[PDB]
């Protein structure tokens, strides 16, 4: 034997593209290595800072180190995040961002990390070899969308853009033929050959795929281990999985109003509905959801934001529909204790669009789980979720992503109905998969072996 010793912590280094939405889950992983002794510094700008530092939970380990982003060609002149940009402006905030190369090589330099995590700074590699650390490339998604998109097998032509069968068609190898585009989703998926600054994306992430030490992926293998063998397979790299890295989930007490509201209600028969704080819909949408609600006949909790064009969500909603919903249904344009709802006794559905947290919450919860998707990696999960492992449902669509109340209250009820077969097949496995993922262990497990894999 030789004797034990207390392994030397790791000093990682995380430079995240600048959005928001990359920031907080890097942040998130922070706080899980920092909590077993590790040392962080994550590089980000000044407004960034103000916005996420107090996600920050260990603060003696974990350091926030300001990176100034240059002014452009086209760049408003605050601009730092993705959240000071309009979509015709990605490219000067590309530009701009590959413009700190100087700034960040300075800091690695001074900070002499061991490790440094990136995502679209395909630049990094080339630093690495300069200074001496060594790297992940750490996806704050999903792996499917990763596997389907950019990849060697997948030829994408850089003259012209890519077309509608060329994106639905997944490349060769790949290892499913349920967790795919079917139709006109495919054009959700355009962006793999968009332009993003001086260079086309799938050129930038080629790059960052190809030149890092390890891919990191924000999943498990219980869920996505084809997907990860797959682009294993297709960089010749290995993969390293963190697990999703959720966040605390907030505790404190529900409302006083919505939970006496849902206090009304018989356990597990109220349906809660809410696509996150992003996405906004049409008035016309927006009335077939509700109605798709009323035509369901049960109790109803919607949280969404008002639609293009009303005051509020009062002037949205069609004609007679508050009369004839009174007691049973709400229709709430604010924000709400999502977690809180959830986990109330009352509530036994929950409809969703299947982001990221969306999916891992519904996942989590003792409700049955209705999909409505928008974008590439929505539909993605939601495949997996209600094709591949059946724990789920997912409302019908049409041209630019239309659903109808028919379908949706259709949906709704073949997961509500005690008698509906549909319901209890999607019931028992949410069951079974829950009974894994809440497996005590099960979460720290991934952690624990994900920094096992960083020590090589």
């Known amino acids: 034997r030789m004797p034990e010793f207390e392994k030397s912590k790791l000093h990682i280094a995380m430079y995240p593209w600048v959005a928001m939405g990359h920031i907080t889950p890097f942040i998130h992983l922070a706080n899980e290595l920092a909590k077993r002794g590790h040392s962080i510094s994550i590089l980000l700008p000044q407004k960034a800072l103000l916005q996420l530092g107090h996600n920050n939970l260990y603060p003696d380990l974990i350091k926030f180190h300001l990176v100034t982003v ?39 330099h001074s900070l002499k990390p061991d490790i440094v995590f990136y995502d679209f700074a395909d630049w990094i590699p080339k630093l690495a070899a300069q200074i001496g650390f060594k790297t992940v490339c750490y996806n704050v998604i999903c792996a499917s969308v990763m596997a389907i998109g950019i990849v060697p097998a997948r030829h994408i032509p850089k003259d012209r853009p890519l077309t509608e069968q060329e994106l639905m068609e997944p490349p060769r190898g790949y290892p499913s033929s349920t967790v795919v585009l079917r139709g006109q989703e495919a054009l959700t998926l355009s962006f793999i050959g968009m332009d993003y600054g001086a260079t086309k994306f799938d050129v930038r992430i080629t790059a960052s795929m190809q030149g890092c030490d390890a891919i990191g992926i924000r999943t498990c293998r219980e869920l996505e281990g084809p997907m990860c063998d797959y682009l294993s397979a297709q960089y010749n790299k290995p993969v390293f999985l963190s697990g999703p890295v959720l966040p605390e ?15 009304k209600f018989k356990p597990k028969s109220v349906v809660y509905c809410a696509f996150g704080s992003q996405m906004i819909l049409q008035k016309n949408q927006f009335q077939e959801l509700v109605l798709g609600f009323e035509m369901t006949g049960l109790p ?31 229709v709430h344009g604010g924000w709400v204790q999502q977690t809180q709802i959830l986990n109330h006794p009352s509530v036994g559905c929950f409809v969703s669009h299947c982001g990221f947290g969306s999916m891992w919450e519904s996942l989590l919860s003792e409700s049955q789980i209705v999909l409505v998707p928008r974008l590439a990696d929505q539909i993605l999960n939601t495949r997996l979720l209600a094709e591949e492992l059946k724990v789920a449902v997912e409302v019908e669509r049409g041209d630019m992503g239309w659903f109808s109340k028919e379908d949706l209250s259709k949906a709704i009820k073949s997961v509500m109905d005690e008698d509906s077969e549909v319901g209890k097949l999607v019931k028992q496995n949410h069951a079974k998969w829950k009974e894994t993922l809440v497996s005590p262990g099960f979460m720290d497990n991934y952690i624990d072996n994900f920094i096992q894999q960083l020590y090589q």
């Open 300 to 330: 109803f909790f919607i949280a969404l934001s008002k639609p293009h064009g009303a005051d509020s969500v009062e002037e949205a909603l069609p004609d007679g529909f508050l009369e004839r919903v009174g007691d049973r249904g709400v």
């Open 249 to 263: 989930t907030p505790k404190g007490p529900l409302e006083e109003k919505w939970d006496s509201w849902l206090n």
């Open 70 to 108: 240059p002014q452009v060609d086209g760049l408003p002149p605050g601009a730092e995040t993705a959240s000071d940009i309009d979509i015709t402006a990605k490219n000067p905030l590309a530009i701009a961002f590959d413009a700190t190369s100087e700034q960040v090589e300075t800091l690695l």
